[PDB]
Design brief:
The structure is a homodimer. By secondary structure, the first copy, chain A, is α+β, with helices and mostly antiparallel strands. Chain A has one domain: 2-Layer Sandwich (Thymidylate Synthase, Chain A), CATH 3.30.572.10. In chain A, the strands form 3 sheets. A 6-stranded mixed beta sheet of chain A has the order 1-2-8-7-6-5. In chain A, helix 10 links the parallel strand 7 and strand 8. The longest helix of chain A is centred in the C-terminal third of the chain and has 19 residues. At the A-B interface, strand 2, strand 3, strand 6, strand 7 and strand 8 of A face strand 2, strand 3, strand 6, strand 7 and strand 8 of B. Bound molecules: 5,10-methylene-6-hydrofolic acid (TMF) (2 copies) and 2'-deoxyuridine 5'-monophosphate (UMP) (2 copies). One 2'-deoxyuridine 5'-monophosphate sits at the interface of chains A and B. Chains A, B: Pathway: Pyrimidine metabolism; dTTP biosynthesis. Chains A, B: Homodimer. Chains A, B: It is found in: Cytoplasm.
């Protein structure tokens, strides 16, 4: 079925992956190197075995394709996947000066001073960001995220180059070139970053009709993480596709450290337990055509029914 | 045998690849997306079915690992793989002022004004570069090649960062991180380049012992091109490996547009015609240890016997 490369790669981390420490000491079963393929005209690649959210992914990528680096658009839509490095700056600031938020992050689940205070301090940081039009700019604006990596990579001699703007040109004009890449690894910025980009590079292809794309995620979390990432670039591939004029072909997901978490063992065993129901259908607003102008309403999802959702505990 | 992922990928471009125009209109059988694996302790990954040259690759990578961007070291060793963009600058210069070299490049094979003149003008450009210590600097010095991409990526605010220097540190100190990348795609520089890097990104891994590496070549020529590239990074992997203290594990070669040339059809049919003799053994100078100090003599090749070499006509 369309989603069986994810399953065949989760039962491959699980019993074939070796135990890696990793950074936040909770161990992995790593493997290094995996290409999995998805042909997108059979249907759309998110999982029917385990509920994955589609308005979140939509709003997020939609957010990355405006080059917008501000959570205030994300909050407006109801997305807060990005919240915690923002707060990492707010509660480490000069203005924070209140009720201690040090390490909020994994003192949570460990209750004590942390379950309702780190959480009261979050709706306090958000709301401020949705309204104070300056609070929004000092802390809610992330600087280096995929919208600036993507559409305003800062040059060595003083300004903004929109990569994806030009690549959507080079597909529109020179379809068949082996240079159609957008890159997120910039090393000025790598040594001093929160999380360096995890979807490091990606290259489009024009088969004859049919745009394809290959990603190089460098680091991948299986169970949590890789359901999400397979769909963002299946949407990117799907959205660039509709703007060049071309049919959709296929998305290749290539990984470096693909690893399942040691929390996520039982939950991934639970998932494999089940059968793929038929892959979902996505349609796109055909009257809009410039993709960077896509209101939310313009990307759609024709019958999706997963199972059950699943709890993995708190990643990082 | 160790080299069968290259064969299984040449009979896969050939009759499974589709006809791509490409840029220099001589057509391809492209495919998009291929991971092939090489475990380097079984032996070394260059081909015994078709003579591939090892002092060229050595001298070249050795050249890239000094961050040296000057052909004058390459010539000194006897390597001229790099010559033609150099001349692309010399014969397009202000100083050229002689006997017309316009398009040397594929007016060659087409004889006429071009077989001994573009070629007399090459030994004239080289020799000058080996001796005039200034000629060497105005035209023999390439600026942007893998030694500056690798070890002096120019920053956005005024200077040189040695990527590979720091990654050999981060392996030496934090072995198990999913960030061990060196990147060659810099977009300031991409729109105005001769050939943008073809081996775009690469990431190391520390399995438990055993350094591994994954490449992302973006564009790959099969028959000519991919015998060479599989060995350069099997040497890089092999050389970084000996400096961290770690055993050698495996090299993953990942491609985007892997394509066989329409010239190279009969010659690749000819190649497949034969049987793998046993994979070669490489040893390294164990008393030297800092890799950036490796004289040529320090990397070695224990029995290699290919077949026959093969002629593919003039690529580009
Ligand atoms: N450097 C970095 N790169 C990424 O791949 C990435 C990142 N961080 N983290 C923030 C964003 C948005 N992405 C994310 C991040 C987290 C989830 C997430 O929480 N999804 C889990 C479910 C977790 C749960 O059970 O609550 C999943 O199953 O995929 C999804 C997408 C990637 N992006
Ligand atoms: N942008 C770019 N990236 C590369 O992969 C690359 C490049 N150009 N071309 C120059 C260097 C050095 N490399 C090269 C270039 C050409 C040959 C070459 O001439 N080798 C052919 C044999 C050609 C013949 O039959 O004379 C082969 O079989 O591999 C080898 C390595 C890659 N490097
Ligand atoms: O939404 C995301 C965020 C992160 N990662 C991963 C996997 C690791 O848990 C995490 C950290 O790895 P490094 O920072 O060491 O690269 O990055 C994903 O797959 N998807
Ligand atoms: O030594 C090399 C040099 C180039 N290439 C390739 C394959 C193509 O023939 C060439 C040009 O592709 P683009 O410039 O369109 O990327 O790059 C290799 O595989 N190895």
């Amino acid at each position: 079925m369309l989603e069986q490369p994810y399953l065949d790669l989760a039962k491959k981390v699980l019993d074939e992956g070796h135990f890696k420490p990793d950074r936040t000491h909770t161990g992995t079963y790593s493997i290094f190197g995996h290409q999995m393929r998805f042909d997108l005209s059979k249907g759309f690649p998110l999982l029917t075995t385990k509920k994955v959210p589609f308005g979140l992914i939509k709003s997020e990528l939609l957010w990355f394709l405006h080059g917008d680096t501000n959570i205030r658009f994300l909050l407006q839509h109801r997305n807060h996947i990005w919240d915690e490095w923002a707060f990492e700056k707010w509660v480490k600031s000069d203005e924070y000066h209140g009720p201690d938020m040090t390490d909020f992050g994994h003192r949570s689940q460990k209750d004590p001073e942390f379950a309702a205070v780190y959480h009261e301090e979050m709706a306090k940081f958000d709301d401020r960001v949705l309204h104070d039009d300056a609070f929004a700019a000092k802390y809610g604006d992330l600087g280096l995220v995929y919208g600036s990596q993507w559409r305003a990579w800062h040059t060595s001699k003083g300004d903004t180059i929109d990569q994806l703007g030009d690549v959507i040109e080079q597909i529109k004009t020179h379809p068949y070139s082996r240079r159609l890449i957008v890159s997120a690894w910039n090393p000025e910025d790598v040594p001093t970053m929160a999380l360096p980009p995890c979807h490091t590079l990606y290259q489009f292809y024009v088969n004859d009709g049919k745009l394809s794309l290959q990603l190089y995620q460098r680091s991948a979390d299986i169970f949590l993480g890789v359901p999400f990432n397979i769909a963002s670039y299946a949407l990117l591939t799907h959205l660039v596709a509709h703007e060049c004029g071309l049919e959709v072909g296929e998305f290749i997901h290539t990984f470096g450290d693909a690893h399942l978490y040691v929390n996520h063992l039982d939950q991934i065993k639970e998932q494999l337990s089940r059968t793929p129901r038929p892959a979902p259908t996505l349609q796109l607003n055909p009257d809009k055509h410039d993709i960077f102008d896509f209101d939310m309403k313009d990307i759609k999802l024709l019958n999706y029914d997963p199972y059950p959702a699943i709890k993995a505990p708190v990643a990082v």
